[PDB]
Design a protein around this nucleic acid. Sequence first.
RNA 1: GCUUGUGCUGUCUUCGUCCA
Lengths: 413, 45, 48, 56, 114, 106, 136, 98, 61
Amino acid sequence: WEEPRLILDQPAQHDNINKRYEIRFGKIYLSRPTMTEADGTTHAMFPQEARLRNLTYSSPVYLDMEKSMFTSIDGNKVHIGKVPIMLRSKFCSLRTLDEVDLYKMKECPYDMGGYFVINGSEKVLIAQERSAANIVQVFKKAAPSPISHVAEIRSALEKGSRLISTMQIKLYGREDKGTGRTIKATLPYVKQDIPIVIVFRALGVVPDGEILQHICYDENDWQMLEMLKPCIEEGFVIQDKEVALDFIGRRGSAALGIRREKRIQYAKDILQKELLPHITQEEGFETRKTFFLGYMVNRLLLCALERKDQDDRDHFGKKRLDLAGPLLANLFRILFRKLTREIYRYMQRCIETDRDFNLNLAVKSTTITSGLKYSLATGNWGEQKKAMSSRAGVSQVLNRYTYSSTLSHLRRT
Amino acid sequence: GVKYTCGACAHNFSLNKSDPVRCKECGHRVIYKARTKRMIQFDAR
Amino acid sequence: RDPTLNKTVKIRQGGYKGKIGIVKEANGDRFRVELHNPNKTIPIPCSF
Amino acid sequence: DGSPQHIINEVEQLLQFHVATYMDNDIAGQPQALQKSGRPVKAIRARLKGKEGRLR
Amino acid sequence: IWGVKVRLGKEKDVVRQILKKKLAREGTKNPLEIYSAFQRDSFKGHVYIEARKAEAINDALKGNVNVFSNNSKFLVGIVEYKDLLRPVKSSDVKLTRGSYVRVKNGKFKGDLAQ
Amino acid sequence: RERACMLCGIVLPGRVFMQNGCPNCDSVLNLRDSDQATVNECTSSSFEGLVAVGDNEHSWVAKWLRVDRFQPGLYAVRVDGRLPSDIVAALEQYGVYYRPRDGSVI
Amino acid sequence: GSPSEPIINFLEEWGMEPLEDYDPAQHTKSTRIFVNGVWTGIHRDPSMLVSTMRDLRRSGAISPEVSIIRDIREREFKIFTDVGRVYRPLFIVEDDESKDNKGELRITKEHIRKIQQGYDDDVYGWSSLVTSGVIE
Amino acid sequence: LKHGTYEKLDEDGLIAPGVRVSGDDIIIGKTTPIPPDTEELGQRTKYHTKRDASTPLRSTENGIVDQVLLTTNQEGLKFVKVRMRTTKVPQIGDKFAS
Amino acid sequence: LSNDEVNSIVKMKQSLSSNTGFNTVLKKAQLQEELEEARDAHDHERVARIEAELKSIGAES
RNA sequence: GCUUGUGCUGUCUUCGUCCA
Ligand SMILES: [Zn+2]
Ligand SMILES: [Zn+2]
C-alpha cells in the first residue's frame, strides 16, 4: 500500500479522447507452505521433507489487483511470489503440532525454530546494528579542516522505517582563523552549502531578531549571540523571502535554464519535502521546521562553546538492531518496486497491441521468489546483479555442532 | 531386484530401474535402501 | 589378475584369526585385506 | 563503407577503452569493465600485484 | 540536423511515429515545426531529424518510449550532411546468369554451381 | 508488405500502389490506372534508408533527394532496381528526365 | 514498534501546548517534549506529566516497551516508540514518599505464590507481573 | 573410470547400508552420455558411449554405510543421499578442554 | 506404472485407509489451515464445525 | 583361453584453528 496505484495515460488523437488506465493493489493473502511435484499434484509441506529433498520452505503470496478504465472526452488474486517461512512462527506448520505429532513428523521437541530452510539448508538471519534515526548528533571535525563542528541528523519516516535524507549544519572557520565563524547548512539536492540566515528567511521568517528568538532561548548569553553575529552580517545581503527562495533554486542541481518562477516553485518543493521529512510533509506547516532548525543550531552552539561534550558515538542507547522483520521488509520493498516496474513496462508494450490483457501475465512471481531465495541463500542482502558493493554475511548457515552453539548463533548480532 | 523401504509407512517393495521413486501404498516421495546381506562383524572393543 | 580380488575372505591363522575381510591388492602372495571393523588394511600371505 | 565522423569517434573510443581495460581495469576516474555476471574483468595488471599476484 | 540515440531496432518505428505525429498535428494551433527525419541501416542506433530549433526536437521526441532518458542529442556538422545521405553498395547490379557460385547449405553444401 | 516507388522515391504498401496508385507518379506512370506489371516494375520492396518528410518546400533533405515537389510520407534513400528502357523513353516523350535513385548513377 | 498516535493523544490530553503557541521569551522554564525525535510541544509541569505517563505504562495503558525519558538538566522530555531498541526488565522499588512502602520492592510473596500456582485468586505469568506494575 | 573399486555398488548404482567403505571407493555410480566416436567401424559390445561421473569416498576417511536415501528433486530427476558412520576413539594429539 | 496410475492407486488406498498416524497429522494440519482461513474470513459457522471435527479426531495418547 | 581399467574445475563469501 506504499505505492498502491500504477497509472498510464494516453491522450489518443487518431476526436480527442483522454484515456487513463490505472490498477489498484488490494489485500494480501497468505497460505501455509505447499509443495508442487513434477506430475502436477500438490500437498502440504513440512520442514523435514524440505531438509531431506533439498526444497525451500516457503509459502505463496496473493495480491488483489483491480483494473479500471478511465476515459474523458475533452480483477482477482494474482500470485506475486513465494516468501520463505521461519520455523516455529505463526505461519509455520509446526506451530500447532503438539508433542506427539511433532515426534511423528520427525521433528525434535528441543528444536526452537527461528531459522529458514532454503534448498534444504538451514539459514539464520544475523541482527544488524545501526545508528538511530531522527536524533541530532554533534561531532567535532579534526584539525586539518576548516570545519570545527558539525551537527548531522538522518531522517526516517515512521511508516516503514526507511532512511530518506541526511541534513548537516557545518560550522566553518577555525578558532582565531578564517575571519568570521559562519554557519553554513547543507541541503539535499543543492550543490553548495547555504548560510543559516538565508534558509531561515526562505522558510518564511525574515526579521533577524526572530531568527535569534528561534535559535537562542536566553537573551543574557552574549557569547552565542556574538557567534551568530557573523552569520547575520553575511546574510544581511538577502532581506526578502522570495529572493531567498530564488537563491535556493539556482543551486538546486536541476536542469540549467529554468525560469525564475519555476526555480522558486522548485525551491518550495525541495524545502517542503526532503527537508526534515520526519517532522511533516504538508504545506504551511514550516513553523515546526523553523523551531527544529533553531534547536539544531542551539545544540551546535552549545557543543561549540565547550558547554557540553560531543555526543558519544558508541553509546548503546543510540543504536538500533534490525531483526528478520526490517531486513525482509527492505528486501521486499526493493523486489516489489522491481516487479511494479516490470508490470509498467509490460503494460506500456501491451497497449501498443491494444488488447484486454489478463493481468495474470504482467506479474512475474519469479522476481520476488528468486530475489528472496538468492539473498537468504548467499547472504548478500541486495539485488543479485548489485552483489558487488552490497552487505554480505547477513544470512549464515546455522551452527549445529552442539545445542549451546545453536542457541548462541540464534542470539547473535 | 533391489529392496526398498518407505520413509513414512515402512513398507517393503522392489524397483526395476523404470518405476517412479514413490511408495506403492501411501505414495511417499522418500524411500530408503534395505540393509545388505553380506556378513557384518565387529571386534567388540 | 587373481581370482580372489574384491572377494570376501576370512583369516585362519596369525594374530587376526577369524576376522572377515575383503581382498584389495594381490601381487605376490602378500594379499592386502581390509578389515571390516578396524578401519585399516593389513598385509597377509595367501596361506592364511 | 561509410564514415560519419561522430560514429568513427564513438567506435574508436570503444576500441581504445577495450584495449585499455584489457591491460589495466583499475583506471581511476572511469567505470570498470564488467562481466555479464557483474564482476569486474580481471586484467593483466591485476594478475601481477598484491599478495596473490604473480610476484608475491 | 540533430541526431538522437535510440534503442536498437526501433529507428524505423521512431521515424513512423514522428511522421504520424507530424501529419496529425498539421493544421493545428501548435504543429510539429520540423521538416524531415530519417535513419540509416548502417548507422545503427541513430535517428536524424532536420529542423531549426531544439524545442522542435524536444516536442518531436515527446511522447516516445524508444528515446533514452538522457537527451543524447548532438549537432551534425554541415559537411556531414552530404555524407549522411550518400549511397552504399549501390553500384552492384544483381546476379548474372552463367556465373559460377558456391552453395551455402543443403545436401550440396560447398559444391560449385553455375 | 511495403514497396519503394523507383521514380519518385515514396514508400507505400504494395496493395496501396495496386488499389490507389502512387499519388505523385500517377501523372506520368498512370499507376492508379495500371496493372501489377507497372507496380512491380516501378516499385521495389527492397530498399534502405527510411525517410519521413514533413515540409517538402524548406527541407534541404527533400531538395537533396529531389522529392520537394511530392507528397509527404515514407521515402527511401536507395532503391534496388532501375526503371526499364521503355518507361524511360515514355518519360522522355513527356519531356521529364529520369535520374535513377539506385545510387549506381551519379 | 508501536504507533505514536495514542502517545500524542495522551500528551495533548494532559496539558501539552503545541509549538505554534510557544514563545521562547515567555517560556524560559518550560520543558521541550520530543516524540520519536520530533519536537511536538512544550509543558510547564513535567513532573506530573512524567508521573502520569509512567503510571499509565505500568498499568498496561501504554505498551511496556515504550521509552519514557526525562532529562532534568537539559529541560527535555523524550518518548520513543521506535523499533530496534534493546531493553531488559528490572524490579520496581516503591519511590513514593507519601506511601508507607517507600524504599521497598513492589513484588511480594503473594506474587511469587501466584506465579507458582499459575493463576490469580479472583493464567498468571510474566506478563501479569509486567502489567501489575512490579516489573518494567 | 576412476582408480577405485566398483564391486560394492548394486544394480541401481548405489551402495547398500551395512557395507564397509575405504577411501576413494565408489559409493554412487553415475554416468553421462557422450556422442560415440568412429568405433562404429566395429566394436560388438565394447564401444564407449558414456563418461563416468561417479562419487568416490574421501581419501582420508573410512567407515560403514549407515543409510541410503533415494528420492526425486524439485525438477523431477533422481536424487540420492548416502550417510557414512564411524567411531572416533581418543588418541595422542586429540584436543580437550575444561 | 505411470505417475497418474500411482496417484490413482494411492488415492484408492487412502479411501481404503481407516487410519494412519502420518495421514492423521497431515489431515489435522490441513484442518488447522482451513480453520485459520475461516477465522480470518469472519465465518463464525464454519469454524465451529471445524473445531468439532478436530475435537473428534484429536485427544491422542 | 582367459586377462585390470589409470584422474579434476574455477571465483567469491562466511565460519573457524595457532601465533600476534
Ligand atoms: Zn509408504
Ligand atoms: Zn512514385
